[PDB]
Design a binder for these strands. Structure first.
Ligand SMILES: [Mg+2]
Ligand SMILES: [Mg+2]
Ligand SMILES: [Mg+2]
Ligand SMILES: [Mg+2]
Ligand SMILES: [Mg+2]
Ligand SMILES: [Mg+2]
Ligand SMILES: [Mg+2]
Ligand SMILES: [Mg+2]
Ligand SMILES: [Mg+2]
Ligand SMILES: [Mg+2]
Ligand SMILES: [Mg+2]
Ligand SMILES: [Mg+2]
Ligand SMILES: [Mg+2]
Ligand SMILES: [Mg+2]
Ligand SMILES: [Mg+2]
Ligand SMILES: [Mg+2]
Ligand SMILES: [Mg+2]
Ligand SMILES: [Mg+2]
Ligand SMILES: [Mg+2]
Ligand SMILES: [Mg+2]
Ligand SMILES: [Mg+2]
Ligand SMILES: [Mg+2]
Ligand SMILES: [Mg+2]
Ligand SMILES: [Mg+2]
Ligand SMILES: [Mg+2]
Ligand SMILES: [Mg+2]
Ligand SMILES: [Mg+2]
Ligand SMILES: [Mg+2]
Ligand SMILES: [Mg+2]
Ligand SMILES: [Mg+2]
Ligand SMILES: [Mg+2]
Ligand SMILES: [Mg+2]
Ligand SMILES: [Mg+2]
Ligand SMILES: [Mg+2]
Ligand SMILES: [Mg+2]
Ligand SMILES: [Mg+2]
Ligand SMILES: [Mg+2]
Ligand SMILES: [Mg+2]
Ligand SMILES: [Mg+2]
Ligand SMILES: [Mg+2]
Ligand SMILES: [Mg+2]
Ligand SMILES: [Mg+2]
Lengths: 154, 75, 133
RNA sequence: GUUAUCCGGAAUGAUUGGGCGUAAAGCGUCUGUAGGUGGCUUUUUAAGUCCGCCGUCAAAUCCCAGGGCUCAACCCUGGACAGGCGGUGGAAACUACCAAGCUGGAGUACGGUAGGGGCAGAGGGAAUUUCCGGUGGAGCGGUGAAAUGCGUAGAGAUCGGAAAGAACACCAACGGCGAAAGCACUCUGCUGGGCCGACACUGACACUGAGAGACGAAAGCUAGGGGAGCGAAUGGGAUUAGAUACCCCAGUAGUCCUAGCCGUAAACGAUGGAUACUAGGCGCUGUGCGUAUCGACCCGUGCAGUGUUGUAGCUAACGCGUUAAGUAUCCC
């Protein structure tokens, strides 16, 4: 999914040397997502390199039986700050551009998200990833703490 | 000798070093380096007195009448 | 050392972020109880006491590095709440719960220190010391 | 649909929810009054705090559950979470209070030791300028190149005299003390801090600070002195289209001292203060310990400060990195 296409420029004695930057995110819509960035002369080739880069950067988002987040979480990258919190089933995914495309492409069905701080599409994508990467799932906190599930549920 | 750390002894040592410093501050008026110290030490003594007034009313009044220390500024 | 609680917390947070298992902290009724509780929740390996020159030190062993020091998925967070500047209290129906209950909230109440779990069982509110992830 | 009004989005006045090295932003620096916060242990009390019960916070509205107008809006019945105030019964951890304790925080004594800390009083030598002589006898001086200027009324040069003021070569160092401003030829005297080692002692006496106070480069000002050098202003000589500038030749305030006023600087670490806590490497200053010899090293170490690289972590990057711009608490 192409999130953003921009025309960045290097400048040479001749003139303006134009390239396209592509910010693209890949997912299966099944709980696997990644971001990648690429640069080329034509839209098409940039897009492609973006794809290939993302595919080698990719991670998994912890999901709950209703397709949402285990818990509330913040995230920080650059000036991008990101806030995600789980939602009741049937609220869909409400968020802004980077955060929402990444979330949606992961397959998260119901989530609240807001990016505070900056708006750069890219850093918000990365940030989202750092958010959902640090998501601990209950089985694992029960494994860490060394305490049975039913005890923490309470 | 007595208590060398006692409130009243300390306040004495201070009052005394101050009245001593007074003569030097009178003879050489341009020495600000020294005056700054005076003001510091006077501050210390004033603090101890406030403390002692909090802790024991009697020992305090006895002391400031004894060492001829000016009455406190809480009035 | 204007706040003692916050300071203990901090010594942990710091020693934790620097990948050390061993911390020296200064003991106190509060300190000791908090650490006990930390052990019965299971955020920390082992505690013990030491004494020298009428000083008490609780040394804390800490949960080992996560399958190396470089690749850490998890850290162990701590946050002061009621602090000398603003003291936060809560009744029974506002008692906090952390990350849906994955983490724990420490409360000082009339029945002593506890977690939010205990407070819910016994029906008590009180002063919220800190949160733990 | 357009306009007006209000809230939103706006985390853009921020408790939840931001910042102040370079982006707007740390008082120039301290001392300190109100005010805020403040170490550990036991007891007391119960003001906060918590739990139960009661009174009330009118009806209508909002929220939940039914019912009526064919539905809905609207109307009607019943009931309640919040949240507030007041009475009463309990709990006692934490803040607060009360009584007694404790040193690791803060101080005091004692003994050490380094220092351009400060004020005052003595003394020193170079160099420069002028003046008085002797020699000598045409140029000195200056610039990118010149000229003004000084010189046969004997300049400069050189030797010998006096006299005066100001500044202190080498040491000097990416070194020392200071709150900052700043402080250095030498010496003596009056005095401020610092740091270190010992239990010798008191026992939280702490940290910060609205107002307020003191100090505070240089220029400047009032009054009296002083006046070599330098030198705003000013004048001449150039250079230039011009040159109210740069360069040269002169040269007054001022620079210096005493007694005051002024209170501003890129007063800069462009970094408020205190406390705690988080790798190292290489350095220095002060001391202390053990070793080395039995006195200088030497080594390893403990502190206290000071300098350079750099890990974690932080940051928009640069960078900062135990002397944080890191992780937290308190005040401005
Ligand atoms: Mg940030
Ligand atoms: Mg936004
Ligand atoms: Mg309440
Ligand atoms: Mg707002
Ligand atoms: Mg805030
Ligand atoms: Mg801002
Ligand atoms: Mg600027
Ligand atoms: Mg600025
Ligand atoms: Mg400053
Ligand atoms: Mg000022
Ligand atoms: Mg102060
Ligand atoms: Mg006070
Ligand atoms: Mg108090
Ligand atoms: Mg306490
Ligand atoms: Mg009503
Ligand atoms: Mg209804
Ligand atoms: Mg109906
Ligand atoms: Mg009704
Ligand atoms: Mg009520
Ligand atoms: Mg009541
Ligand atoms: Mg009690
Ligand atoms: Mg007491
Ligand atoms: Mg001489
Ligand atoms: Mg001559
Ligand atoms: Mg110093
Ligand atoms: Mg001295
Ligand atoms: Mg005693
Ligand atoms: Mg002020
Ligand atoms: Mg003045
Ligand atoms: Mg001056
Ligand atoms: Mg004038
Ligand atoms: Mg001249
Ligand atoms: Mg002229
Ligand atoms: Mg002249
Ligand atoms: Mg003067
Ligand atoms: Mg200013
Ligand atoms: Mg400034
Ligand atoms: Mg050596
Ligand atoms: Mg140090
Ligand atoms: Mg540096
Ligand atoms: Mg560095
Ligand atoms: Mg910063």
């Amino acid at each position: 999914n192409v999130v953003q296409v921009r025309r960045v420029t290097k400048v040479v004695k001749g003139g303006k040397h134009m390239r396209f930057r592509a910010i693209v995110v890949v997912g299966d819509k099944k709980g696997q997502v990644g971001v990648g960035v690429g640069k080329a002369k034509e839209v098409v080739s940039a897009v492609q390199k973006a794809a290939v880069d993302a595919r080698r950067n990719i991670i998994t988002v912890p999901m709950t039986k209703y397709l949402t987040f285990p818990h509330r979480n913040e995230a920080d990258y650059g000036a991008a700050r990101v806030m995600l919190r789980p939602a009741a089933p049937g609220t869909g995914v409400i968020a802004g551009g980077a955060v929402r495309t990444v979330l949606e492409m992961a397959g998260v069905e119901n989530a609240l998200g807001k990016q505070l701080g900056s708006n750069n599409a890219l850093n918000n994508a990365r940030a989202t990833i750092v958010a959902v990467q640090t998501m601990r799932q209950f089985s694992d906190v029960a494994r860490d703490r060394g305490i049975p599930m039913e005890e923490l549920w309470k | 000798e007595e208590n060398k750390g006692s409130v009243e002894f300390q306040v004495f040592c201070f009052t005394n070093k101050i009245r001593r410093l007074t003569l030097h501050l009178e003879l050489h008026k341009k020495d600000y380096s020294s005056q700054r110290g005076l003001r510091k030490t006077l501050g210390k003594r004033q603090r101890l007195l406030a403390y002692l007034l909090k802790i024991n009313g009697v020992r305090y009044k006895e002391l400031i009448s004894k060492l001829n220390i000016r009455e406190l500024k809480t009035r | 050392g204007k706040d003692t609680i916050a300071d203990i917390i901090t010594c942990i947070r710091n020693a934790d972020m620097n990948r050390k298992g061993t911390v020296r902290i200064v003991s106190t009724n509060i300190t000791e109880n908090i650490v006990k509780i930390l052990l019965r929740e299971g955020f920390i390996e082992n505690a013990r006491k030491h004494q020298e020159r009428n000083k008490y030190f609780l040394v804390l062993t800490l949960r080992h590095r996560r399958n190396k020091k470089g690749p850490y998925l998890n850290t162990f967070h701590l946050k002061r709440v009621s602090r000398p500047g603003l003291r936060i209290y809560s009744n029974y129906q506002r008692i906090p719960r952390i990350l849906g209950g994955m983490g724990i909230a420490i409360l000082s109440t009339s029945r002593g220190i506890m977690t939010d779990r205990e407070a819910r069982l016994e029906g008590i509110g009180g002063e919220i010391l800190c949160y733990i992830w």
